[PDB]
Structure formats: structure tokens, C-alpha cells
Subunit: 354 residues, 4 copies
């Protein structure tokens, strides 16, 4: 047997109608009991299992998967989620780390990529799978993507030792800190633009073991609650005025991700550059990410954004750059130089160096 | 014969190295003369053509294509381009509209999509092709995408009557107000996420005539120099504080595109909503666009951003929403309600209205 | 407001079981489906005291309630053992019960699914109701599968929409049956419609391409063609293929052949090979030229293009469709060879796009 | 400096109109001289180079590339090409192997994949790049894919040590024995369904060095002219009769690739199986390949084709299986069992083992 904790945070996967809009819906365990694909009643009574614990039917070979549903309260649309919510989740995983062989987190799609990236950083030396999943259509609606997304997540966590925060949707397993949402209606909602999926499910299950990270058995799990809140994201647009940037970068901001044009460029007008420079003197750290979905930030142009306190984000997603910025700035007693060096390193598989 | 104007604004297609970085490079016409694929010397002398005018070799069928190079000054990296630059370009097209059968604009990739969208709006009732093109690698570098991108743009403008601001790159013609940049290194740099290409070039040329807009022969070209400058784009991120939004939306801002999560949603925390409401009372107009590349903004959630002075952008790119916002706000003597109604309408093929 | 469907279970991996360490066809489908809430609403069934043969889907978002009856063919087959006769039997089942039901779903193996869809497309002349083929890469009895959602989707499409075509539903896509081919032997996205958009897509909502879906011909009755010519074949060219091997392949009693050719529709121009094609034509054989390429059309243009006596271009047809069309046309009674060739060159069921 | 041989065999890249159809067109070197992108006149006179030898302009970094055009005669539409033509090409490469650092072969698209795969096998222990290229539109037609396809091939051969028979088209370098033609009109005409490209050209050049084969500097080049001609390809279709298969497999055929359904299956009707068995007793070797573009042949069904003298082709393209069959059967003095063992091995990067 293998034992999993299913953490239900909210999201469309479990929503219900009310006032003609979808809102978070409680009572997930109650529903799941009634579904044979999610709970084997015969086996449960045959082992007289507890009322909190469900049991997946069997695969021919390999371990039986059991899981316990922890329903957060209140449940949230992922658009209302913040760093504090993700810290709460990490702490749940920390509290119960020893009792369970893996974790599945049901989450809304709207900020799924931010959440996956954040947990990726907070959960240092992670040894077990943490699989985020969600859906475009609620599980209570007959034609949905929820059933197979939830089952796949449970089967991955239950059967494979992939020590990473992942996202499972639409028969693909992605590295969590590598994904971003590309489609607001279709079931293929997420893309991992700069890295293959860690796994694919079809007639058989193909895992890219060459990419999956190695379990560091010696080192214990260190959960970082010390994530810096005063970080932001700022997207450049043509003609963006210096005075607006000045305002954006005022104290108490400590870090910012600048989403720039193309290979990592912005306007070279001096008043703008002066503000970035002024912000650096105040001790602000800036990460340069491209607005483009695919490719890497690279120097080469007179418009390339480089300089004091600007670290290139290379091929990072913006969700990952923001989380990494939150993580690095939250570490105690480091110099600015050191912090910049940590930002330029691949810390959780989120960044490919040249 | 068909006559085109080639407007060279800058961009990597024509850049040179200096101090180990790429910068804008002048002297394009001088280079193009020396390249047989871009200038047929034999034919030029046989017709004793002017020194400013180049001539493509014969294509398979149809008319011979001649073109004139207008090299803007100063040439720009597209990251330094603004509304005023795009207005200058529209005015060049206006000045010479009657002398030429079509236009090609060489432009940097960095803000290409913004430029295409802006010109799309400024050039009301356009009857001729305006094809933007660019490259990831300069034409002076041997291994490049510049040669074939420039040639294709000239051949499309020269041979087909597509009355739209388009982007031609990597054997695809896209509707200008429908594109966005998706790859910062690869030659397939742009995507039209919510509309097929207008055309594809291969062994033969396939055009989607069912999508191409109709020439309005009766109506004259109206160029809009009256584009509102005080518009911005603001991307939401989780936990974005109300105080930062307050600062962003201070006067003199008149319009903003909010890039929101998923199907068009944001945080429902009251202090944030309060600021959007306060901005509306100051008369600000807000367009809701999705951060997602593909799909549409749609209501359905308690977190859907809708309300006073918020217009849904449906499936618009953010580049298009920003340009449309600049256009609509620049029109004289309209009420806020009228302006909102215009934003919710498909004005240049940039927006698809939902089905029933 | 109820709609009634017939679910015809022919075999295929969707319903297979292990035996001797290999998958083989598994009976007892209705017994399984009863126990699954997503496939049978027990509460509603007792509330209407329904028959034991008839299952009932839960309520979908809108529209009619869907009821269906399972007909389990015997013997059940791996689709690799299926032939024209099996597909004729299926067509006849649909004929027998045509009046009692509003639509049809056929569970079928993937191995020859495309051939089966194309064949039924031709046999069912003037079809007025949906016939949706579906299958799976993993059996429904195996926990982690594509079977559950593929079967449900097929039932919901047939049950809710009037698409009068033989279709294939897999992996949230509805394809025109005579337009598909199998591209992936392991992944759930197993089929592609290379030269036509899907007829429909399922997501948060259902998008149908009504401007492609064929029109119901309510005047004309259903005519089922049992008269399908069995002596037809498919022959794939490979470089250096010798004339003597082709001679042997095309011996009587063969009446028709699909030649899968290179590129835009080309083959070796060596005379001994051309002589055999010509000899076959004199014996009265008909030949259809299809490209080995997945995407594109057969077109003339090269000295190696295969054209001539009794060779009809297949344009953009799949080879599964060309073979079925060849079987259909050759089975029609009392037509000249010239007439038969004219019919092959026409789009008879939406399988072929004519040039302009 | 680096020196390349450009072998022009024919194909649309160099065709001309005549009688309203395209046919092979001579005089390539004459055309190339007049194009600055393909020949630097200033530099040539500055080094008073020979009349047979062209010189590319300077690329960004590295060596200057010079090349010599060898125009085969007669030139061919690739639909007329056979094993003998490919042997002639291999022999050209063998004759001049020491004088040149790499090779480019201009070839028609129609049988490009068969040609690439054949040369891949004939050129044992190859140490230098051999890059096939072609086009959908002739180079003499103004709007074409020929110019950039030919240049890219020269630049790859000229600048990188990739010791494989490759195909360069549309800014992608593919392993030759891994490609097949998927589009008869579009410039993206070829696909490598079961293997990433070896390289991609964009703003910079990305090579997948983890996939590129290693130069075997100890071992000399062995060219195999001994390629078995009596091999064929047979595609199954539903209901294919046993009597037609009987006829197909008659002597003197020595080997066949059976293109089967799905994961590698065919009809189980006994009269058909009997003929495969009869062919095996005559000593015929059979390779099972899938008709599907993507995936692998695998057992699992009662309809799986396995047995006496049937070797699984796993994820091989059919072009590659046919060439491998031609190669293995041409080797002198091996037992049937040995031959089968060689077929089941990855000999040139054409097959992925489980
Ligand atoms: N499909 C979803 O989950 C969207 C939802 N608004 C959420 O993120 O909570
Ligand atoms: N590829 C390019 O053109 C990038 C350049 N920085 C520009 O936009 O001008
Ligand atoms: N997945 C499948 O259905 C393949 C099976 N051999 C069949 O065609 O019946
Ligand atoms: N485009 C091409 O090269 C096709 C031509 N028929 C050939 O194979 O020679």
C-alpha cells in the first residue's frame, strides 16, 4: 500500500452554481465515495477502513493507492490566492510529511502556475511527489476534464517517485515551476514552453527520468515560510513613462520582475534608465524576463536591459521568476551580491543555463 | 507593373554591430541594389529606370513589381518606438497613398505587434496592403531570415489586394491586429492565437479570402493622428496590492488594459475593487484582457472583472486592445458610454464576438 | 424531451480483457456500464421504471435526456480482423433499426477504425442521423484509461446534435469519418484529420463547424449499399519497386487499386513499370493515385506524375477513404468504366476537396 | 578554411520548366557564381581561387567555407532513384573522403527519406557530415525555399562536426534515418516523428549534442556497395487476401517490411499466417513496422505479428527499416539468426530500444 494526502484548496474542479456564477463547492469526499473509479467500496469494507480514507481500485501489479481528503476552509477561487495561501499549503505538507508517501493539491487554474512555482521553492529538499491538478469544468458537471485529471494526479503520486512539485493536466505531467496557462477554455490549458513534460500518459506511461530530479535522502525537508511578500511584476509596454515606473518601484518594494520585449529589451530613453538605476541604489533587485512564451533572455542589443542589480531570468517563466525572487529575498543575512548569484542559478529545475 | 513603397523604420533586419551590440544600420537601398533577388539590373537599364527605384525579377505569373525605398531618420530599435513614431508612419502612407499600389514596413520585432495594431486603427477604410515585416537576424549576416521575409512581404503587397495592415514572417501572412510575439529566438517568432493566418506561402500561395476584409471603394482613406497618448497596460499578479494599483491609475491616465487571469478574473478583495471603482468615477476606461495566449474573456465566476467602465476585450490581443483604446479615446466629442460601445465592437477584424 | 440511441459494440481495445498475457475481446459491456453512475442514472431509471436493456445518462447541462440501448455483436472482434463484410453487417444493423433511434454509436478498435468509418460513410447513402465511431487505447476495465471519456462523448454527441455523418469521436474531438487516419499507436491523440478541420471540439462548451457539416436530405430515403466490391487493393510504391512485382499484384481478379505514390503524386518513370499500369488498364482495372504524404494533395506538374488511362487522381483523400470509395463505385451495377472514373473524381461524401 | 563537396543529383531545387512540367535543370555552378550569398567574388580573386570552387561570405564566427560543385549526369527526379543511384553517391563520397571536411547532397524530396536512410547504412563509421537537402520550389523561381535550404546545409556541414547522414530543411537538421515526408506542398515537408531534430537554426544555432553520434576516430570508413536489391515493402489493408500476399513474397524476394496496423498488428486469419510462415521456411526475413507515423511496434494483442523470421521494427520509419534490411542482407556469410540479431539492434541511431 501507498498512502496519499489529497488537499482540496478550491478551484473550478469542485465548484457549484449559485447566483448564476460558479463558486467554491464543499463536500468533495462525499461525492468521491459514490464514484467507483475513485473509491473501491468492496475493498474498504473487506479491510474495514476508516470513514476519512478512500481507496482506488487496483492496477494489476504495483501498490494499492489509499488517500485521505483534507478540505481547506474556506475554499477559494484561485484568483483570490496569495503567498500566504501557498505558505499554508506548504505547512500542511510539512505537518503531515512523515505520514504520507505523496501529495495531490486540487487548485484553480487561474493562478495554478504561480502556486506550483511557489511551492517548488518553499519545499526545499523535497523527497516525495506533490502533484497539483485542476479542471476547466467542474466534476459535478457530466461532461468534464475533472475526473481524469484528478485520477491521473492520484495515480502519479501514488505510483512514481518524482520528488518535485508538478502539474498534472490533460494526460501530461509538467514540472511545476516550468508551466504557464495558455488557453482559458480548452482542456489543454497549460504549456511547458521551455522544457519537455516530465511524463505523458497514453497506452503506457512515459517518464523522462533524465529530467526528473534526484532524491537527496541525506538532507531533511526544509520548508521556507520566510518568503518575501514585497515583490512585484511589471510588464513594459511601448512608451511606458518614467514617472509611472518611478511610482511602481517606490519603497517598500524589494524585488521586481520586469517583463521585457523580445530577447530581453526595453526603451533606452535615459529618464527610464535613470529610474531603474535609482531603484538599484535604494537596494531593489530586478529580474529581466521576456514577454515571449518561448526562448531565452539574452544580451546583444543596445536596448538590452542589463546593469546594476539586474539579473537575467534566461528562459524562466514569469511565475517562476517571481517565486524565486520571493524565495531568495526571504533568506536571512545575505549580501545583495549573494542574492543576485542565487537568482542566476538553477535552484529547482526552473532555469536552463547556457 | 505594380509600384510599392518600402518604408525602412529600423529593426534587426537592417542592424549592424558596434561596440559588440546590434544598433540600427543605414544604407539599405545601397545593399539591395547589389542583390539579384532584390534588384534586376538588366531590366532596370533596359527601361532606364530612376536611381531611387528597384525592380524585382519576374515572378511566375502576373505583374512586374517595382519599389522605392524610403529610409526613415533616425532609424530605431523597435523597443524605442511609441505612438508618435507610428503616427509618423501612417502619415508617410497617407502622403504617398495615391502614387503606390501597396506598402511594406520594415520594423523591429520587439514592438511589431503594437505597431501593426496601431496602424490597423489609424488607417481607416484602408484599400491597399500594408505589410509589416522584420527579422531575428540582420540581412548583412550571412545566415538569416531577413532575405526571405523582406522578399515575401514585397511579393504579397505587389501581387495581392489584401486591404489590411498585416505581418509577414516565415512564410505566413497574419492579420496585424491579431498577432503577438511568442519566441524570442526562433524564426517562427509570431503567432496569431485566435485567428488563422490570412495567407500561407509554399509550393503555391493559399489565401483565406473568407477572412480577408472587403475593399470599401466608395469611402476615402481617413488617417487618425488623434490617438490618445495617456493609455497604459497593467498586468495583474497574485496578491497585487491596492495601493500599487491606486498609484498606477492616477491622473492623467485615461485608459488601461488590465491583463487578468484565465477567463478574465482577478482578486475580489474589496480594497482592490474600490480602486477600480474610484478610477471609473474619475472617468477612466478599463479593458479586460486575458493573460492567456489563446481563448476569450468570458463571465461566469464571482471573480470575473466586470462593472462600471470595464469593457470585456473578449479574444483580443493586448497589443490590439491598447491600440483600440488609444483610437477610441482619441475620437472627438463622444460620451463615455459611446466610447465603451465602440470598444465592444469589432472595428478592424481584431475581435471575434461570441456565438449563440 | 428524450432522445434514444443504439450503442453497437463490435469489439476493440475499449472493451478488451487479458487472457494468456494478451488482450482479447471482452463480453458483458452492458453489465459493466450499469454499475457506473456516469453511464447509467439508477435513480432516474427506477423513477421511470425503465426496461432492463436500456441505460440512461445523467442530466447534461441543457437539452434532452439521453437514453441508449446496448447491442453487443457476437463474435466481438479485434479491429485488425475486420473486413468489408463486417462493416456491411454494421450498416445493416443501422438500417434495420433506423426508425427506432435518433442516432448511433459504434464501439470499434483503432487498428482499422479509419477504414471502417470511411466504408460506412459510403454504404450509408443519404444518412440523416449521427453515426459516431469511437474506441480507446486502453480498456475501460483498466483504471487509468481513455475509454470512459471517449464513450461518454460519443453518446453525448449522437444524443444531442444532428450531425448526419459517419464520424469519429476521440480525445474531445469529432472528426469526419472519411477524413481521418491513425497517426499514433500509443498516445490518446491517436487520430488526425489532416486535410479538414474537426467537425467539433468539446471543452468548457461545444464548438461545432456547422458550415462544414453536411445537410440533411429529408426527401431522400436511406439507401444502404451491400453491393461493395471486394476485389480492391492498396499498393504502396517504394523506390526501385520492380515491374514484375507490380504485374503480379495487379493480376485478375483485381478490379481496383489505390496506388500510394511519392510527394505530389509521383512514381518511377521507368517504361517497364508504366507498361504494366497500361496493361492493367487494358484489362479494365481502375487505379486511384493517392499520396503517401499525410498532408496535402495529389497534383500534376512533374514528368513523374502518375496520370493516364484509367488513373484517377485522389487529390487530398486519405487512402482509407480512397479504398472505400473505390469499393463503392465498383459495386454499383451496370456502369461503364468511364462513368465509374467520373464518380471517383467527385466528392461523394465530403471525403475529397476539389481544386479551383 | 573548411572544404566541402556539393553533390547535385537533381530534384526540384534545380529544376526547370519544359513542356509545361518540371524536369531536372543543369548549370548549377553557373547560377551560384552570380549570387553573393553563395559566392564571394572579391575574396575569390583576392586568393586567385580555381574556377570550380566557390566561397561563402564570412559567417559570424569560425572558419571560412569553400565548396566544389559536382553535378551528376544525368540529373534525376528523385522518383526515378534506386539503390544503385544511392550506391553511386556513397562511392563519390568514398572517392573524395580525404580531400573534404564534409558533404552536401542536393536531392529531390520524393525519395529523400529513403536516400538518407540508405546512405546512413552504406557509410559505416562515418566521421564527417553528409547533409541532404532539397526544396519544394526551384531555386530559379524567385519565391522559393531553395536558397535558404542550400545555404543552411552548407553552413552546417561547413561549421559543425556532426558525423551523420542528415536532412536539412526549413531551418531544421534531422537525423537522416529518422525522417519521413509528411507534406507534399508546404515548406515544412519532413517530420522526424520519433526523435528530436539534431539541430535548429534561429537567432542562434541550437544543437542536441546529447543525441549526436560520437566520431569513431579509430575505425576507418567502410562503404557498403553490397546492398541487397531484393527487398520490398508491403502495406497491409483490411481484408488483404492470402493469395495476394503469397504472390508478393515469391522468390527471389529475400526481405520485406510489413507495414501493419496500430501497435503492430494484422489479421489473424490462418491462411494469411500460413503464408508468412511459408515464406519464413523459404528463408525470407520480415520486419514489422507500424503504419502509424508516431509510436512503436509492441506486443500485447492476439493480432500482434510475431514469429519465425519476424523481427520487430520498434519505432523505425519504414524508409529506415527497408534500408537496414538491404544492409543486413547484403553482409556476406551470416546465418539467418545473426542477421535477425543485427536487425533488432540500433545500428545507426535509427531505432530506439526499450
Ligand atoms: N478553471 C478554474 O479553476 C478557474 C477558476 N476561476 C479558478 O482558478 O479557481
Ligand atoms: N529582432 C529585432 O528586431 C529585435 C530588435 N531589438 C528590434 O525590435 O528592433
Ligand atoms: N486500441 C485498439 O483498439 C487496438 C485493437 N487491436 C483493435 O483495433 O481492436
Ligand atoms: N520537390 C521535389 O524535389 C520533388 C521532385 N519530384 C523530386 O523528387 O525530384
Amino acid at each position: 500500500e501507498r498512502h496519499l494526502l489529497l488537499i482540496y484548496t478550491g478551484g473550478t474542479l469542485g465548484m457549484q452554481s449559485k447566483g448564476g456564477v460558479l463558486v467554491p463547492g464543499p463536500g468533495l469526499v462525499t461525492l468521491l465515495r459514490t464514484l467507483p473509479m475513485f473509491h473501491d467500496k468492496e475493498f474498504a469494507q473487506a479491510q474495514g477502513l476508516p470513514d476519512h480514507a478512500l481507496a482506488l481500485p487496483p492496477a494489476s501489479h504495483g501498490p494499492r493507492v489509499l488517500y485521505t481528503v483534507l478540505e481547506c476552509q474556506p475554499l477559494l477561487d484561485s484568483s483570490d490566492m496569495t503567498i500566504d495561501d501557498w505558505i499554508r499549503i506548504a505547512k500542511i505538507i510539512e505537518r503531515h510529511y512523515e505520514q504520507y508517501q505523496g501529495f495531490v493539491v486540487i487548485h484553480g487554474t487561474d493562478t495554478m502556475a504561480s502556486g506550483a512555482s511557489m511551492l517548488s521553492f518553499m519545499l526545499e529538499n523535497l523527497h516525495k511527489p506533490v502533484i497539483l491538478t485542476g479542471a476547466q469544468v467542474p466534476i459535478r458537471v457530466l461532461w468534464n476534464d475533472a475526473r481524469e485529471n484528478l485520477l491521473g494526479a492520484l495515480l502519479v503520486a501514488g505510483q512514481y517517485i518524482i520528488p518535485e512539485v508538478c502539474l498534472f493536466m490533460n494526460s501530461q505531467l509538467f514540472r511545476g515551476n516550468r508551466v504557464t496557462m495558455v488557453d482559458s477554455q480548452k482542456f489543454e490549458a497549460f504549456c511547458s514552453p521551455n522544457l519537455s513534460p516530465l511524463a505523458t500518459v497514453g497506452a503506457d506511461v512515459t517518464i523522462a527520468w533524465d529530467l526528473v530530479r534526484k532524491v537527496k535522502w541525506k538532507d531533511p525537508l526544509v520548508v521556507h515560510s520566510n518568503m518575501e511578500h514585497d515583490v512585484a511584476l511589471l510588464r513594459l509596454y511601448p512608451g511606458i513613462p518614467a514617472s509611472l515606473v518611478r511610482a511602481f518601484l517606490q519603497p517598500p518594494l524589494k524585488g521586481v520582475v520586469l517583463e521585457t520585449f523580445g530577447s530581453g529589451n526595453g526603451p533606452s530613453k535615459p529618464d527610464l534608465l535613470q529610474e531603474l538605476r535609482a531603484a538599484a541604489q535604494r537596494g531593489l533587485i530586478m529580474v529581466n524576463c521576456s514577454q515571449c512564451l518561448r526562448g531565452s533572455v539574452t544580451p546583444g542589443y543596445a536596448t538590452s536591459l542589463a546593469g546594476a542589480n539586474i539579473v537575467s531570468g534566461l528562459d524562466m517563466t514569469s511565475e517562476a521568476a517571481l517565486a524565486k525572487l520571493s524565495y531568495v529575498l526571504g533568506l536571512p543575512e545575505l549580501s545583495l551580491e549573494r542574492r543576485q548569484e542565487l537568482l542566476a542559478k538553477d535552484l529547482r529545475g526552473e532555469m536552463t543555463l547556457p
